[PDB]
């Protein structure tokens, strides 16, 4: 058999990967790049095998020939007799979150406010809200809608990066990796929690996982869910318990991609590696837990219960869904 070379995005992911590689007896080894797009190029060159991706990144990777292999599956809202690996994935809820104290703000008054995004090109943080905004405004100038934003991956001198904070030293402002304080689901929700932005584009789970003591991290440890609201497309505001009826879209779960010629081998190695290090894995928590990273969602989301098999050997457009694909393509016409 061959080793699987994973691609880690930024140095925190690389440290986690190196621990996984040590635990796996080098069944998995690590390449690292500074951004997800750069990891996609490593895998296109054959210098890495796979990484797990948000759906917006699966689009980029899929246009370049990489294929979905396994998808993240989080705990299901309904009881299922099926093993996690065979349970159909449910998709996550993209939402717009604000503070309850910021009383005037609705979907219809977002113009000229301060926004917090997971990163350019990601589903809940970017493709869904900016796709909706370009369509409702009839303008491609989405870079001028919010007065200032943190949208990792954008031009660091531009208003889309003006709220980003970089690392402890203030280096790497706006880089689309975990070194940027406001990157990702947790960083964009911390950008709202600290009142750097007025609105954060994240998913429902983020709000729950980082409030009411579900996170012990310093910036989160004291946040209360009741201090947040969701913005609904009909211009109303709801408590965060109401995400099912107040979301922007349902997103396809993050999933692992690879070259087509290495998909089968990546799939077999991951199914064995989660049996060891996955949730209730043989060797988790004693030795190593593949789906933990102290809330930082490194390599996989921390709420992942398993990687699941895909039904119907789907292409990347079947996995993303025709509608989501079309919405991306419409939005990328602006660029």
């Amino acid at each position: 058999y061959t080793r699987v070379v994973w691609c880690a995005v930024g140095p925190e992911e690389q440290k986690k990967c190196q621990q996984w590689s040590q635990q796996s007896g080098q069944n998995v080894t690590c390449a690292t790049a500074s951004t997800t797009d750069d990891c996609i190029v490593l895998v296109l060159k054959g210098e890495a095998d796979a990484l797990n991706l948000d759906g917006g990144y699966i689009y980029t990777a899929g246009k370049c020939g990489l294929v979905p292999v396994l998808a993240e599956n989080r705990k299901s809202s309904k009881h299922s007799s099926l093993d996690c690996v065979l349970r159909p994935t449910e998709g996550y809820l993209a939402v717009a979150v604000v503070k309850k104290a910021n009383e005037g703000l609705t979907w219809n008054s977002l113009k000229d406010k301060k926004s917090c995004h997971t990163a350019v090109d990601r589903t809940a943080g970017w493709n869904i809200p900016m796709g909706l905004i370009v369509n409702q405004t009839g303008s491609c100038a989405f870079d001028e809608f919010f007065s200032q934003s943190c949208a990792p991956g954008a031009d660091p001198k531009s208003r889309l990066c003006a709220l980003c904070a970089g690392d402890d030293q203030g280096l790497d402002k706006c880089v689309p990796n975990s070194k940027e304080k406001y990157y990702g689901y947790t960083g964009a929700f911390r950008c709202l929690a600290e009142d750097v932005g007025d609105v954060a584009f994240v998913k429902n789970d983020t709000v729950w996982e980082n409030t009411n003591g579900e996170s012990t991290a310093d910036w989160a440890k004291n946040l209360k869910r009741e201090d947040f609201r969701l913005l609904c497309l009909d211009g109303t505001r709801k408590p965060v318990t109401e995400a099912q009826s107040c979301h922007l879209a349902v997103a396809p779960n993050h999933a692992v991609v690879s070259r087509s010629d290495r998909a089968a081998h990546v799939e077999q190695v991951l199914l064995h590696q989660q049996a060891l290090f996955g949730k209730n894995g043989k060797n988790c928590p004693d030795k190593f837990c593949l789906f933990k990273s102290e809330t930082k969602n490194l390599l996989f989301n921390d709420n992942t219960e398993c990687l699941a098999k895909l039904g119907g050997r789907p292409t990347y457009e079947e996995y993303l869904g025709t509608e989501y694909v079309t919405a991306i393509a419409n939005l990328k016409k602006c660029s």
């Binding site: 797009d37 996609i40 190029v41 296109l44 980029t60 246009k63 370049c64 020939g65 393509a329």
Partner: peptide
């Protein structure tokens, strides 16, 4: 309806 970004 278009190609790889890289």
């Amino acid at each position: 309806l278009e190609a790889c970004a890289f």
